[PDB]
Amino acid sequence: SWSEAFGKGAGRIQASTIRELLKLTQRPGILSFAGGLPAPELFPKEEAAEAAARILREKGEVALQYSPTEGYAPLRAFVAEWIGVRPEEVLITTGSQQALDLVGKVFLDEGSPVLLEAPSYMGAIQAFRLQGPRFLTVPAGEEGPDLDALEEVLKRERPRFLYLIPSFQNPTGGLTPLPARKRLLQMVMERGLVVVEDDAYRELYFGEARLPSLFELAREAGYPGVIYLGSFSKVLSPGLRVAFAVAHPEALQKLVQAKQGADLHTPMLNQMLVHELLKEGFSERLERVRRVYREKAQAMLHALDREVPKEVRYTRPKGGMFVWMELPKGLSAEGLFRRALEENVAFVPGGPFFANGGGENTLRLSYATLDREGIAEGVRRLGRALKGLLAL
Amino acid sequence: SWSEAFGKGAGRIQASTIRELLKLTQRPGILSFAGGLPAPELFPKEEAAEAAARILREKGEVALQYSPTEGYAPLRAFVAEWIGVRPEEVLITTGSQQALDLVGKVFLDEGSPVLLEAPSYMGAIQAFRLQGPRFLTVPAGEEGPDLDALEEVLKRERPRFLYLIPSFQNPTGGLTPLPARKRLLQMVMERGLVVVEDDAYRELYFGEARLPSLFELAREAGYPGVIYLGSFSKVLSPGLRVAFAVAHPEALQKLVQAKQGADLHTPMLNQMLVHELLKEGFSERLERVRRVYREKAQAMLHALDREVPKEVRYTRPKGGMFVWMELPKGLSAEGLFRRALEENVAFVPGGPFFANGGGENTLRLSYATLDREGIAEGVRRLGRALKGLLAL
Ligand SMILES: Cc1ncc(COP(=O)(O)O)c(CN[C@@H](CCCC(=O)O)C(=O)O)c1O
Ligand SMILES: Cc1ncc(COP(=O)(O)O)c(CN[C@@H](CCCC(=O)O)C(=O)O)c1O
């Protein structure tokens, strides 16, 4: 009997709705506002092809061979220069999703408290839940985490770490403002707490400039407790699975040793390809990806303003890939999903973004994948489904 | 500070000596008998370059995008055809190292019994150790595990699974014979036990044919309890990080959900590239791989027979990448390691292959990486170092 054969871990293991939706959304005719999949037109497939061939011809014996866990050295150096750290502080990971898995392994045990936002990224919840922690949450909004709520929790609990996405939070799109970051840093430093800062959407700001990361603020202050996660997924290629973690040597060593057991190393070809593509013109590329997402966000907001009844509330992003919607408390996002799917529109129901449940009346919308036309038509269909279900 | 902050997992995390040795061995000038790194001239650099470039040009929107966790469909289909199963029974993983991580997560909890050989593959020990299990061991030799010893364990203990490498075991090189495979299957079936069969070296047999796998024997008998692992690492490219697990649907689903949290999915370019490289001429490539390793094995044995004193014992492989050496109780492998390295020769001391300690007089030699001359020359230095150490 498999249920009898499985360990406790298997009982905590549940499928990710984002992961499962991809099987639906990659089918033709589906208008996807579901997974945060980058606009296909942004993939530099032609340039990647030329670079991959060159790597394999000129350096194939390196690209194809086992390599040390820490990563391709020129890639680590590039990340170090970009982030403002030294190459030896950088671990290359197989997507930031891997860094989440690793931090879970290093910090969490059965019953151990961990703190994140409600809602937060379901892939983090999933990775952490494997360890059987006790989730503590504080509400998150358009302005980031409720720091009065956080203050209350920290008087009562000592979380193993705080998992936060200060820049264009998944799924709310929230941007934690600078005074709030500084306040958070103080709260963390006073208690000597660990922060896991997920900066997946770092470069996808729509305004004039990005805000300093918690990690930059900690480094300025000389606080070693921020583990910084970044990824090439949203800026170049999610499919390559190449990302990085930066951390104090002791924490970094454990992440390294956990990674050895997880996959040995991130594939070398992929690391080398990322470095070849980005070593020249990265700033110019980042400007283009910001422009593309800004335009899609603008189209999305215009369509929502037009099509959605004004009893329904939704966030207005200043960056990233997501709009977060809240239905009159009573209306089910899962019910809404069924109706929208009949009209070939997919979104992510909000429930699974809440680590302790609730949020059955919320949903996440991604404007990353569709063109202007698809966004307007998808939202039109959504509005109609919304109006129908509000009536009943 | 960090030690206080870490969870119980951090204390069970230690570095792999194989993984650490690569930092040393990849440097020019060192003759490596350490990590089982495939012969570089076996890498199809030019064909890979053409295939990677074509994949990215024609299918970049797929290769560079997020993809479902289960894997690239034509690859699952290829594997299924090769192994003799259906596509739906295959999970593509990020090297078989990931499969080991995943089976640990699905089956083991703090204090849960796991059974493996003494010695066994250190990457499996390291992956499993994370979960806090109790390692139960049985001795392994040239003919595989001690089945009388296994019987005695099984009367008293119910392991969450048995981890075995019946074909060219790491590190002993042992081949579990067919009668022993059939006996093992009977013990497993009588007690309804789960087996994790790691077949990394499946195709690297030196004789006229391979033995039926425990998975194949199980399937013939209609027993669903063997989880079968394979890899493209030893037959194509380890650096690509592409492997597979085949299992009963309930087991496979939990492995899938655990993988979602581990890395989302194995990189897509890599899977498509493996498929493109192997879709024609796989049998012919396999025959060539077998010839190359047989030759290196022959060279290794020729040189050991001639350079090594007769007090020292070593296995004679019928396949795979390894020779396992036992020093006459009184010699330290760590001491021999110090001496050999002064001579630019690296191997893996045997201790870390023993999950519960021991084996300080043992070491593993790999003939995979060096050519015939390098093997001859490395072994003569090793032999000279050994004799010197034997003298005192
Ligand atoms: C805050 C945050 N951190 C980590 C990740 C994982 O991305 P990588 O592993 O770095 O590609 C993500 C993934 N974001 C998208 C992409 C997931 C798409 C998928 O799993 O199919 C989403 O939530 O839809 C994230 O939002
Ligand atoms: C029985 C067995 N199972 C799984 C693995 C992991 O290989 P993949 O992740 O499939 O590349 C291995 C890897 N074997 C080699 C290669 C590891 C090289 C390295 O970690 O640098 C060794 O033990 O030296 C293995 O022997």
Nearest to B317 by CA among B145, B172, B166: B172
| Pair A275, A244: CB distance under 8 Å | no
A197 - beta bridge partners? A164, A228
Asked if A107's CB is within 8 angstroms of B5's CB, the reply is yes
Residues A216 and A345 in one domain: no
For the annotated binding site of A for substrate, the residues are 36, 170, 364
CA–CA dist A28, B9 (Å, integer): 44
CA–CA dist B163, B153 (Å, integer): 14
Rounded (5°) CA angle B108-B114-B120: 120
CA–CA dist B174, B364 (Å, integer): 12
Cβ atoms < 10 Å from Cβ of A31 = 22
Residues A96 and A167 in one domain: yes
Q: Is the peptide bond before B40 cis (omega within 30 degrees of 0)?
A: no
Torsion angle of alpha carbons B39, B41, B47, B52, nearest 10°? 50
Instruction: Please say which residue of B225, B250, B281 terminates a domain.
Output: B281
Nearest to A257 by CA among B5, B230, B122, B114: B122
Nearest to B273 by CA among A83, A240, A359: A240
Experimental technique for the deposited model: X-ray
CA–CA dist B337, B379 (Å, integer): 13
Instruction: Please say which residue of A254, A281, A308 terminates a domain.
Output: A281
Residues A223 and A274 in one domain: yes
Nearest to B128 by CA among B158, B163, B156, B77: B163
CA–CA dist A231, A296 (Å, integer): 21
Please name the member of A57, A67, A160 whose beta carbon is closest to the beta carbon of B45.
A57
Contacts of B283 (CB under 8 A, 6+ apart): none
Q: Is the peptide bond before A171 cis (omega within 30 degrees of 0)?
A: yes
**CB burial readout A131-143, b (16+ within 10 A) else e:** bbbbbbbbebeee
Nearest to B86 by CA among B96, B74, B76, B73: B76
CA–CA dist B146, B115 (Å, integer): 12
| Pair B36, B366: CB distance under 8 Å | yes
| Pair A180, A144: CB distance under 8 Å | yes
| Phi/psi of residue A110, nearest 5 degrees | -50, 125
Residues B213 and B277 in one domain: yes
CB neighbour class for B329 (10 Å; exposed up to 12, middle 13-18, buried from 19): exposed
Rounded (5°) CA angle B356-B360-B361: 135
| Pair B143, B175: CB distance under 8 Å | yes
Cα B69 from chain centroid? 23
- Residue A15 CA: distances (Å) to CA of A104, A129, A261, A337, B52: 17, 12, 23, 18, 31
CATH code for position B389: 3.90.1150.10
DSSP calls for A202-238: TT-B-SSSPPPPHHHHHHHHT---EEEEEESTTTT-S
From atom 2 of ligand 1, which residue's Cα is the shortest distance away? A200
Residues B102 and B179 in one domain: yes
Q: Which helix (H) or strand (E) holds A276?
A: helix A268-278
**Which tokens go with B220?**
């013939």
| Pair B300, B367: CB distance under 8 Å | yes
Residues A103 and A226 in one domain: yes
Work out the end-to-end distance of chain A between its first and last CA atoms, rounded to an integer number of angstroms. Answer: 44
Top mutation candidate among A70, A264, A265 for ligand 2, by most atoms within 8 Å of CB: A264
Cα B185 from chain centroid? 21
Q: Where are the alpha helices (DSSP H) in chain B?
A: 2-5, 8-12, 17-25, 45-63, 73-83, 96-107, 122-129, 147-156, 178-191, 214-221, 249-263, 268-278, 282-307, 333-342, 372-391
Residue A289 one-letter amino acid: V
B243 - beta bridge partners? B93, B231
DSSP calls for B329-384: BTB-HHHHHHHHHHTTEEEEESGGG-TTS--TTEEEEE-SSS-HHHHHHHHHHHHH
Residues A81 and A188 in one domain: yes
CA–CA dist A360, B127 (Å, integer): 37
Residue B93 one-letter amino acid: T
Nearest to A273 by CA among A92, A40, A53, A37: A53
In angstroms, what is the C-alpha Rg of chain A? Answer: 21
**Ramachandran category for residue A330: left, alpha or beta (phi over 0 → left; psi -120 to 50 → alpha):** left
Rounded (5°) CA angle A175-A178-A182: 120
| Phi/psi of residue B257, nearest 5 degrees | -70, -40
- For B311, the 3-state DSSP assignment is coil
Q: How far is B4 from chain A (nearest CA, A)?
A: 10
Sheet holding B345-349, edge to edge: B31-33, B345-349, B362-366, B322-326, B313-314
**CB burial readout A212-242, b (16+ within 10 A) else e:** bbbbbbbbeeebbbbbbbbbbbbbbbbbbbb
| Pair A199, A210: CB distance under 8 Å | no
| Pair A205, A319: CB distance under 8 Å | yes
- For B301, the 3-state DSSP assignment is helix
| Pair B349, B337: CB distance under 8 Å | yes
Residues B273 and B288 in one domain: no
Cβ atoms < 10 Å from Cβ of A87 = 16
Nearest to B37 by CA among B46, B47, B24, B26: B26
- For B66, the 3-state DSSP assignment is coil
B57 CB within 8 Å of a chain A CB: yes
B364 annotated ligand binder? yes
Q: Which helix (H) or strand (E) holds A113?
A: strand A113-118
- Asked whether A64 lines ligand 2 (CB < 6 A), one says no
Q: How far is B131 from chain A (nearest CA, A)?
A: 9
CA–CA dist B340, B342 (Å, integer): 5
Residues B269 and B325 in one domain: no
Residues B179 and B302 in one domain: no
Residue B1 Cα, ligand 2 centroid: separation in angstroms? 34
Q: How far is A330 from chain B (nearest CA, A)?
A: 31
Question: What range defines the domain where residue B115 resides?
Answer: 65-281
Residues A225 and A347 in one domain: no
A365 - beta bridge partners? A323
Cα A365 from chain centroid? 14
B24 CB within 8 Å of a chain A CB: no
Q: How many domains does chain A have?
A: 2
Q: Tell me which chain A residue has its CA closest to the CA of residue B58.
A: A45
CA–CA dist B387, A17 (Å, integer): 62
Nearest to B196 by CA among B263, B314, B106: B106
Nearest to A59 by CA among A275, A270, A269, A271: A269
Which residue do the tokens 């590039």 mark? A78
Count Cα neighbours of A146 within 13 Å in the Cβ-side half-sphere: 13
Asked if B65's CB is within 8 angstroms of A56's CB, the reply is no
* Length of chain B, in residues: 392
Cα B250 from chain centroid? 25
CATH code for position B170: 3.40.640.10
Nearest to A68 by CA among A359, A271, A237: A271
CA–CA dist A302, A34 (Å, integer): 19
Q: Which helix (H) or strand (E) holds A76?
A: helix A73-83
CA–CA dist A305, A375 (Å, integer): 13
B25 - beta bridge partners? none
DSSP calls for B194-224: -EEEE-TTTT-B-SS-PPPPHHHHHHHHT--
**Which tokens go with B13?**
């995390």
Instruction: Please say which residue of A266, A281, A296 terminates a domain.
Output: A281
* Length of chain A, in residues: 392
Q: Is the peptide bond before B68 cis (omega within 30 degrees of 0)?
A: no
**Ramachandran category for residue A126: left, alpha or beta (phi over 0 → left; psi -120 to 50 → alpha):** alpha
Residues B145 and B271 in one domain: yes
CA–CA dist A214, A220 (Å, integer): 10
